[PDB]
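Re: [help] complex structure
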Amino acid sequence: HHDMAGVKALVTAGGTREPLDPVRFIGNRSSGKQGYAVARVLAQRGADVTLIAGNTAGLIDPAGVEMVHIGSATQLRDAVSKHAPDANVLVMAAAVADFRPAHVAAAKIKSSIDLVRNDDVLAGAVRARADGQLPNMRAIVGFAAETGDANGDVLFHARAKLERKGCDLLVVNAVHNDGWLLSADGTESALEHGSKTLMATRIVDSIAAFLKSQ
Amino acid sequence: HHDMAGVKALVTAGGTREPLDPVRFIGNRSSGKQGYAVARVLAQRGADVTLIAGNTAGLIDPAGVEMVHIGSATQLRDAVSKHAPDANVLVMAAAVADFRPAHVAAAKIKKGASEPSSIDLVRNDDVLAGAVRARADGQLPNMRAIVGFAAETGDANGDVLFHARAKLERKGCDLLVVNAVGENRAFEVDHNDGWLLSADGTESALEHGSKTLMATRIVDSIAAFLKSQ
Ligand SMILES: Nc1ccn([C@@H]2O[C@H](COP(=O)(O)OP(=O)(O)OP(=O)(O)O)[C@@H](O)[C@H]2O)c(=O)n1
Ligand SMILES: Nc1ccn([C@@H]2O[C@H](COP(=O)(O)OP(=O)(O)OP(=O)(O)O)[C@@H](O)[C@H]2O)c(=O)n1
Ligand SMILES: [Ca+2]
Ligand SMILES: [Ca+2]
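Output below.
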């Protein structure tokens, strides 16, 4: 039915672009499709959805969703801050750049590129809510792409990321391999590889169950 | 009619992406749409078109055009090398990255706690200049027209036409399409700075109109150049 009726949901999706000059940037390969899918399913289930979108694979605005377009990780941060005070659910599906060029050239570059860190927006929301600044925020959802490497298997890294971020739910993609839904209470649920819509339904199901538990 | 009948055209379009690791890259804001429009007009007018496409995942493949997909400027270079021997016209509409990161990480660079490491850059080969030189060295006997594209702006050192003329003579191409950019949309300002520059000294204004109109003017200019020879 419409379980999300009355819920205000803030979703980020797509990759950010960190400018080097007016023409060039550091970007990433995120398509935004999974984040758009979650926004679409939330709206379909009655939520009042605001979608902050960075760079996407040409995607169409989902119907009934309020669109906010950003470029950089800092612009995404400011857009999340602007829209956070009344949101009940934050879904951080955007591939947010960890670093940005330290200097942006005023004109086209005809030179090593120095980098500085961007703010961790997801962690900022978790801390703000813990510090009493987001009383309406009932669920904070992070996304992660994890792989096994010489320092640990994929699930080890995913669990560590849940613990460090402190969010309520971590949607993990193992990079047709299945992913995971990791909850802050320790629940771990396999996320089967299906269409983006079916996976979005499973993600939103988990959000709805978490909201009912609280 | 079909003036481009019998012409084999190799077109590059879109921006390139220069990897930092499997997920991140240096990129640019070019859409590839103007180059796609030139390929589409060439085919509509009878040309046998091969389109080497960069960062254009959401664009529709032009009908009747052979598609070649590349990622980086070096991959674009290699694709042009492979396909140029078949072409009579090379249309270099791609926004090719001048630089690439010197090191490509095997895995996505992790957010540590120490200071982030700068990115060293290295120059990518000038594909257009490489084609001009190969033709001059006798390696491209079928190549009748080499077309470059450039976005130029006036700055403290000169206006658009000053910079554009200098780039044409410098690149050594037969035609330089200057500022075939913009979408002619509401609230988009037209700086009336579009030009078609020929290596014989002819200079014609390129009106900023739709992508299809500009592609038609560009292909008209190619046809006029081919007929001049
Ligand atoms: N500057 C950033 C970076 C990431 N994110 C959010 O954090 C989650 C992904 O974090 P991740 O990149 O996996 O964690 P990092 O601390 O950056 O660790 P890593 O070294 O693996 O990149 C996503 O929800 C993403 O939207 C964010 O809010 N702000
Ligand atoms: N590594 C490169 C760079 C650009 N091009 C081609 O060169 C033309 C545009 O050149 P432009 O970027 O305007 O001149 P540059 O020599 O790169 O000078 P600038 O730094 O001003 O860009 C286009 O046709 C583009 O496809 C190319 O073949 N190989
Ligand atoms: Ca990161
Ligand atoms: Ca350039």
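The CA atoms of residues 9 and 218 of chain B lie 13 Å apart.
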